[model samples]
Target chain A: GDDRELAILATAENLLEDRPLADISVDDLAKGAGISRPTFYFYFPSKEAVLLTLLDRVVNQADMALQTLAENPADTDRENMWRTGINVFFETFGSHKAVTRAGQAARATSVEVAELWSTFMQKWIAYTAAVIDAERDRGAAPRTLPAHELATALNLMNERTLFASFAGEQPSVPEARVLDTLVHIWVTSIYGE
Target chain B: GDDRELAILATAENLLEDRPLADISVDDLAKGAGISRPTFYFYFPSKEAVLLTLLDRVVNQADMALQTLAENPADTDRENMWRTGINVFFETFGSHKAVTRAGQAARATSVEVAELWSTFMQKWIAYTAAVIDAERDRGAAPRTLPAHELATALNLMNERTLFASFAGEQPSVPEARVLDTLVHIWVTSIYGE
Candidate 1:
């Protein structure tokens, strides 16, 4: 049963490579997975639900990389650590570009998935805030805004920028320049260096 | 005929107040405008075309406010001018929140509208880059990334951040804080103040 559910999730991710979430129907997802329509429901309630699962999985994997950066901030050069954190974020989402695009599109309509996105963001904001606080106490980070608020804004900036960069069928700023610009803003806004 | 087209556009924008663009159909829009389904297509190719027209109208209006800021940079206080630019941006979107949400959602699927959005962004970027170039030449702004690249990144950050803030169903960060933080990032990234 679990294997079948994984297959359905995998099938949805695969289908999203060529189509937006809105363009893919539940029947199409089911057919792609070699399951009956009713059987697809038995494993997942809807296409958005399948996308939510996929987003959660990718975010979980990405969080490990972020946590690793967070834990080693004291030992690593801030610039190098920030670069690694961003590289991991961009690469992880790039590797799952189709799922990321569909998840973002579904988020506009699915309250459940939107809530999941928020919860995921809160984890990042909290971790980022802690780092900002520690760095400020050491006189390293800027202090123009409270740590939590600054973290909240910076994290949202990254989230929105990345979503637009990955939007399906949309023309985006060049990928390398976009990443460099984001890192520039992150580092300059926080450290003034 | 022009009057009917205007009515259809108005009706679509009004309906969007209560639902996502994808959730509303051509028949629904036609019914709201007291027109036949075929009439909707007669005036516009599809639902997304109607949305593209609506988006173009709002962006044109918004650009007037931005133009005022752009033209008077030498006379106004930098921070005050920046605040007004951002204020105009947020207020314009807030007043048309429903349409804004719908247009952003549609952009993921409509290649035409997506291209329109990029064109709109380019105008803003060019105007902002000119201002950044002037400020840096006057020794008022920081020399970080080149003016054009910095303007591109900053404009994209604002576009993405505002989209998420205006997403109809999601829990948003406090409006004042979101605005303040963006302005802070913008001002600090450019002026180091």
Candidate 2:
């Protein structure tokens, strides 16, 4: 199964190197995988599934890493902990450049996939809100806005920044720049007067 | 030709009442308009064209109305100008609930069309930025952020609020409430510290 997953990802990566993900066909992927179209279907429904499979992998990796931080939670540096988690997140998505592009293309073109993508972000929002609540409990930033609003704003910012980075005309920017811009937008807009 | 255009708009509206835009076929529109499918193609190359045609009418109406107000440039209050323009803009898109949904669905489903939609927004950004510049010159609001960043934030806020309204969520807030929230987000985040 792992070998099959590897073959699908390799084929997707190879195909995307030459063309946009939207341009890739199921037949092209199957042929590249040395499998029949039906066999490919048995494994995944659409080209999007190959991308979703990739998301599942990256999300699991993020979750595992976040769990380690959660286990070692402290009162003082929890905001830094959450920020570290976000940085790892940016680094992970930034590492898989093509995957992020494909995901953005999918979100733009497929409502079902977009809803699925939003649901994935909603989970992140929940986690982030919890972290912010922990900080508020520790009197880190004075509990400025409702945690939900902060979480959702951060969630939308992540979407906007990712789209601006990958699908924007430039298609890439320094992760540090994005992180700083996001922090400025988040802190001043919510906490500062 | 104008009568045909009105007929097409009316027919598209009827089709929308019965079904979501994605479900409406060219044949459905032609039948609704009492024209042959070929005739429908003569007016609109595709189903999406029906939506674009409707939006064009809305834009032209607003453009003409704004032109009328431009006669009294000295009397034009810069803040009021933005307020009026955005009010009409919202009324145009938000008045026809189906058109808003259809436009959004199309944007979510087509990258090329999304670019077209973004172009429509760039025009608004230009108009809004001009107003911001005027306000700064008048010393009504201190010039702080770059005009482009302010415009981008303004547009992002509008984008978020409009999408929420289009989704029928409306957030249990009045239209003015939504506008105030959007304005606050823009002003605090982009205009001042």
Candidate 3:
């Protein structure tokens, strides 16, 4: 059963590389997975459901990357850690752009997807706030507002910037410049350096 | 004929306050406007078209407000002008929340609406970039990144933050808190104070 689920996920990911999530149906996904449509249902309910599972994996990996920076908080390497955190997020997101786009598009139309996405965002905000609080105690970050509020704004900035870039609809800015701008905003806002 | 179009726009705005855009159809709009479904199409191509018209009005007002900030160059009340610029944006959007929400929700699904929204955002980004350039020349804002890139990121931040806050699905953050947080990010990032 586990092997079949993995096969389905791998198939959907491969198919998404060629087509959009909305265009790829259950029949297509099932056929790609080498299984009947009913067999596909046994593992996942819908196309968006498969995308949701994929999104969860990516978010989990990104969260782990974020936590690495929190754990290694030396004063000197803070800049490096910040760069690492932002790079990990974009690289993971770039690797799975199709799934990320599909999940974002679904969130607007699906209550379940919206709730799931919001929960993940809230978790990130909480972790970021904790990091900000720790940095403040170390006298390394600004005390402009409450840590939670600051975290929420910064997280939303990152979220919006990354989504636009990955949506294939942003202005004609270079990928490196986009990455640099996001990192600059994060570093200046948090560390004031 | 002009009066009829105004009636249809007003009726659609009123109806949207009570229901989602997708839930309200051509038939419903026609009935609310006291016209036949065919007449509704005669005035506007579809429900989304009426929304596009409404969105244009809001965008125009916002552009005007942004221009007001750009035209005034006194250094002392620059902060107040910035606050006013941000306020005009939110106030215009707040007054037309239903239409704004409909337009946003439609962008993911409607190609015409997506193009319309993108054009408007690009215009705003260009205008904002010009403002940032002026400030940088005056040594009021940081020259960390290109003005256009800085403006794009800040504008997207405001767009995404406001959409989430107005979507009524946020994580229970207070409305004032959200606004204040956005303003803080904008002011601090642009001015580096």
Candidate 4:
């Protein structure tokens, strides 16, 4: 509806390209967005808000990838289904690497992002566990560990591994290898075959 | 080597409790340490340095546990070694939750902390991958995924999960289930048994 609001989003996504969220102040957001400070506040409360919104947008897409995984029937191409879902996260986060980096780095600084990030992880965990539960019910996968708890570990693994790769922290893991590593863990941990 | 240096270290630890490192200014550090800012400089360069020292002290212990894990041979209590190694991380990070939180939160802000954290993860990943390598050599574990990449995912899982748990967030996962989940993933992913 409001183009200025959309402009703030555009400016934040670009500014966060290679800088910390803490480094980009509210003034920077407003100035870069061609708006006033009050205007920026009217659109988003703080710098963290814009970053949080950007993060939510990407997470919403990744969450949908998981939703599809939960609903998709496992067949001959079962592993490919998982690979596709996990691939969405690696792609989305990697595409918005800067935004993901800023939001994660701002977790302690922003209660809003931290709490929402918490909720997002919980939902993803629940959704993944649901998939696992269905598989076990179908006798396709064994009931090994508690599904939700295992999902928690695997989901958080993606969180940190992606941050290390894209958070501009000297590149701990080579960019190319992250996707396969994650998919293998998802497949091996859930199926254990 | 000197009492004044010991005094600075002591004060940094105490002040970091319940406060973000960003919240504590160098003036607070010097005043808390019973010295002027200049004198504080004589001891350490910045607030991040004090934290780096504290982080190193705890990481040294956790890394040793991982070292023991690499050397220990599997037995009737085969899974116990991995549990113990992972246990050290939870215990050590839990004990110094505040410092761990501060240092992790400081990563994006502080180049020094980020690089060192990167190295720490690298060493951990290597140490863990070495264990996987040996297991495969003994034909106890399968060559499912590259050992190093798998280790990267697992180790960073510990990293992010520990932060969400102890980094003063609203306790994402309970303290108890985290260990079991991590151990399960490691055993299941590496051995697939």
In candidate 3, what are the lDDT values of residues B1-193, reduced to their tens digit? 9788988899889999999877889898888888998888899988888888887777788778777766764465555656666777778787888988888888887787788778878988898788778888998786878878888888887787777777665553445776777766666667763
Model 4 clash tally? 0
Query: Per-residue lDDT for B21-46 in model 1, tens only?
Result: 77889999999889999988999998
DockQ of each: 0.40, 0.20, 0.55, 0.57
Please, what is the TM-score per model? 0.83, 0.76, 0.92, 0.87
Compute the lDDT for candidate 1: 0.78
* Candidate 4 lDDT: 0.78
Docking class of 2: incorrect
The residue-by-residue lDDT of candidate 4 on B106-186, one tens digit each, is: 776777777778778878788889888988999888788888878877888888777776753443566767787788787
Model 4: CA > 4 A from native: A21-46, A68-76, A168-171, B25-41, B68-77, B168-171
RMSD of each: 3.5, 4.7, 2.3, 3.0
- What tens digits encode model 1's per-residue C-alpha lDDT throughout A113-186? 78788787888878778877888899988577767767777777677667666653233455666677777777
Task: Evaluate residue B155 in candidate 2 and report its C-alpha lDDT on the 0 to 100 scale.
Answer: 64
lDDT per residue as tens, model 4, A1-193 = 3788888888889987856676788998889889999988998887777888888888797788667765664565557877777777888778887778777766766787887788887777787788789889999888988887777778888877877877544435567887878887888889983
What is the descending TM-score order?
3, 4, 1, 2
Error of 4 at B75 (Å): 4.9
Q: Residue by residue across A1-193, what tens digits does model 3's lDDT show? A: 8888888889888888788887889999888888999999999988888888887887887778677766765465665666776777788887888778777887877787787788878987888788788888999886877778778777787887887888767553456677878766776667652
Predicted structure with the largest TM-score when compared to the true one: 3
Candidate 3 residue A128 Cα shift, in angstroms, is 1.1
